[PDB]
Amino acid sequence: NNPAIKRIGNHITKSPEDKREYRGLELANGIKVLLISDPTTDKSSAALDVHIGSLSDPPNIAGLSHFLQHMLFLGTKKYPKENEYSQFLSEHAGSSNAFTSGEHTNYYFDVSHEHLEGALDRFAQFFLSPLFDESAKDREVNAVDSEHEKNVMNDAWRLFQLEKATGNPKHPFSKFGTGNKYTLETRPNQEGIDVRQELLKFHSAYYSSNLMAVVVLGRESLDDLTNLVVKLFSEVENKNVPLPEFPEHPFQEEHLKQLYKIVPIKDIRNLYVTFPIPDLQKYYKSNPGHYLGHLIGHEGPGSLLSELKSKGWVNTLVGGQKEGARGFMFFIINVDLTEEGLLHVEDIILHMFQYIQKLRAEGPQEWVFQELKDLNAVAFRFKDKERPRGYTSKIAGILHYYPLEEVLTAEYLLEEFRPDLIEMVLDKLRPENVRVAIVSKSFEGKTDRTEEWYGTQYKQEAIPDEVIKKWQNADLNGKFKLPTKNEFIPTNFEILPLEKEATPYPALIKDTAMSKLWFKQDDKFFLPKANLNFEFFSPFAYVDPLHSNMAYLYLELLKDSLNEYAYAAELAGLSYDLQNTIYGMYLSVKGYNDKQPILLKKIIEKMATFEIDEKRFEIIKEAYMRSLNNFRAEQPHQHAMYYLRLLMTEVAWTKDELKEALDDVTLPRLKAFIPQLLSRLHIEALLHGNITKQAALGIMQMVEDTLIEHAHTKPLLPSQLVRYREVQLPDRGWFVYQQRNEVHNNSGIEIYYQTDMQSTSENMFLELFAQIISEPAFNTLRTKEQLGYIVFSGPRRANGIQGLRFIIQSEKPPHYLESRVEAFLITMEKSIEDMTEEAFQKHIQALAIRRLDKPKKLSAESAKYWGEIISQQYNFDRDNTEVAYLKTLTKEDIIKFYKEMLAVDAPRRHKVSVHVLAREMDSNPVVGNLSQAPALPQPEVIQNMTEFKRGLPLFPLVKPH
Ligand SMILES: N=C(N)NCCC[C@H](NC(=O)[C@@H](CC(=O)NO)Cc1ccc2ccccc2c1)C(=O)NCC(=O)NCC(N)=O
């Protein structure tokens, strides 16, 4: 029949738990398509992935295909308004994004389900007739510059591009994918290039139907989705472009047996070991590099990390196969280094080769392959249902690699045992084929090369033949054993029947001095899993900086010592999260419920009978100090957000206070602190999953009883269950706090307009206003004025209080940023005046859909409940209630809200601004074609955070529901 469709796939294998319906197909023009039908979904979604990317940039215009990616959002022939796509998503509860990697350009969106077609029609135009408007091109190249700029001082981006700079310079692998204003405007103008033509050429040459894959997920029937896709995409034109390939490895003989010493921005010590390998992707049914990676990166007893860590050389290890492109891959073993480790690199590498030699000695092990195959089969039977935007984007990228019928399963199911491929990859991991990189500040001033894009200081040297040889002669070492059978592999999957008195919301089913237990048997997803959440309260976790430090150090010591044993639980889908909070501790255990009370008991029992190892303590202390220091290198906006948390919360210790207090933490002081920490606690828990009320009360009591037995824990007093308050700003005040980022050459600013306490009405005024401004703020402060790449607006909530915040990071100074934000607010008040009733109801409706969007997986529903509980507002039915009220609001309500709390001459404006100056600006003059900025008041400049808090009231806390 149908001329537009080349073929329709057979049944797409799915999990028997997956209620979604599926149909793959190839259009006549060669687009591979997956259609997904989910008649329950609140948001629909599409993605498109083009098998072209950075590796195919013209050598003379680096960043082109990334730049192209930005430009597609900026208008098409059919929809020429620059921001028609974004504004349309925004008005319909949607969102979009896109990335560029060396081989792919991947675009995706989601939207309210009622508006799939609308969104999809705008979206399809990207691939048909983008405008590449000339003035948009001139504007947007700044966003790309900014994007690169945020990366320049990031250690992972520096290392990522350094590796490319050290392979064969002629290989496409050495290209600079991001681009910047120099590569995409300046050098091009100099060399007489018309970038608008170059974008049109590149779009035209590579954006061919035969290199595309599309996924669409909506409520529509499979057939309705089919007609929609055929209608919007079969006009994409087939230019029959050959898929790029890269058979020649970027690392040839000259590039092997090399050592690189590199200077980090942060104080971090790492060792990176790499081997070039062939492309293993075609072997996906057997997956030799995953097998080798599971072994070499294992963390249990017998393992490489185990030895390295006992010797006190390393704390963490990553091992396995790394993506390259079509034609080449890499195999990596990477570790972090202790101060001792750094002096023993030759030896750490030797142990790496001994462990590899052990694998050669034992040969391939079917039983290990079996274990990996079983785990993966279980991961797949019971995978959490995904959010549509990521799912589509992810599936779009893999329609390029697997038959239609296998796209769901291809990355999970294992079929073939291949001792031959396993041997073959193992014979590549040899010292003659090795590359070695060491990162340490100790190389400060001893380097002689500079990487062009990032500025990285490094030195390159042949590894001495004597060293290659000592490595080639790696002997067996008896500290290394293959792992043994994994006892945490779950086998019990029954979904307990829903109990007669089971509730829609969690229920308070235990209310004692020691503990408060919220509980909900899962009535939605029906996977054999559960989430067990615990807040442990204790005034001794945050009483001062020394205690905060200790709470941290203790819990890190605890995790380091459970690691070897927890890691099996982790391979088996049972994981845990354990950290110190400003109120005490937080513990979360999630995964397959089968073996979960076993891991829970081991954790509480380790925690309350813990014995510290002097060697591990000194190593972790030093790491903690670096981590505290390394804050100086986070980015300006992160700094701005951080200082604002310090200014506005009643109690908060600074990184400076914590560093200072850390030299005073001693083994004996820590040994004392723990029993003290645990002597009086209150526990608030949410147990949510495949479990009964009786199992839940049981698990809770098991945690209490363990602490009672081993730490003699007694209940805390209700009065000592103290939450911190937010600083209460004065009607008409404006305060400014200013600092310098010493590393990055950009500013950051956070601006907080504080409104009032959270409550149904104040929540929906703020939230509605934020919905209405959200997209325009992006479109004004970034798309048009191009202030920076990071531009953000939205509700701030803390400590029961709220307001509107702006976060921008920019080359322009903060005083200027502030002036444009104020300009924009005026604009928004006129915009709300000029807007139709219906435009207003649309915003209501879009917020409404956002707030009502149902969780698709257990842990998302747990998150919502956990939010109600740690905030102690306990408003589990908040979404229906808040929306009921929203729907009642009017244009006049929001104008009044703005005029009272937000306008520049508002009677109750409460403003605080953090300015973070870039490395090289020296004063900040704190006050200062384009919209007119109002005149601002002289701000009170904050000199001292503590004084500032002393001199202001504190808000009440929010009464519980
Ligand atoms: N609220 C609306 N309407 N805007 C949606 C924001 C999407 C934006 N995405 C992008 O900047 C790029 C993706 C990327 O950088 N690839 O290289 C894609 C893009 C997308 C939408 C466009 C919309 C109009 C004009 C040009 C656009 C170009 C984004 O993710 N920024 C990252 C962010 O969240 N910053 C915080 C940080 N990184 O810490």
Residue numbers in the entry: 43 to 970, 979 to 1011
The article reads:
The proteolytic degradation and inactivation of insulin is believed to be mediated primarily by insulin-degrading enzyme (IDE), a ubiquitously expressed, soluble, secreted zinc-metalloprotease. Like insulin, IDE is structurally distinctive, consisting of two bowl-shaped halves connected by a flexible linker that can switch between “open” and “closed” states. In its closed state, IDE completely encapsulates its substrates within an unusually large internal cavity that appears remarkably well-adapted to accommodate insulin.
The P3' and P4' residues of Ii1 face the center of the catalytic chamber of IDE and do not contact IDE directly; consequently, only the main chain of these two residues could be modeled. Second, the active site of IDE is configured such that the P1' and P2' residues of Ii1 both point away from IDE's internal chamber, thereby inducing a partial turn within the amide backbone of Ii1. This partial turn, which is also present within several full-length IDE substrates, appears to be a structural prerequisite permitting extended peptides to fit within IDE's internal chamber. Finally, and quite significantly, Ii1's hydroxamate moiety, amide backbone, and P2' residue all make substantial interactions not only with residues in the N-terminal portions of IDE involved in zinc-binding and catalysis, but also with multiple residues within distal C-terminal portions of the protease. This finding highlights the fact that IDE's active site is not completely formed unless and until the N- and C-terminal portions of the protease are juxtaposed, which occurs only in the closed conformation and only during a portion of IDE's catalytic cycle. As our co-crystal structure reveals, the potency of Ii1 can be traced to its unique ability to interact simultaneously with both the N- and C-terminal portions of the active site. Finally, and rather unexpectedly for this type of inhibitor, Ii1 proved to be remarkably selective for IDE vis-à-vis a wide range of conventional zinc-metalloproteases and representative members of other protease classes.
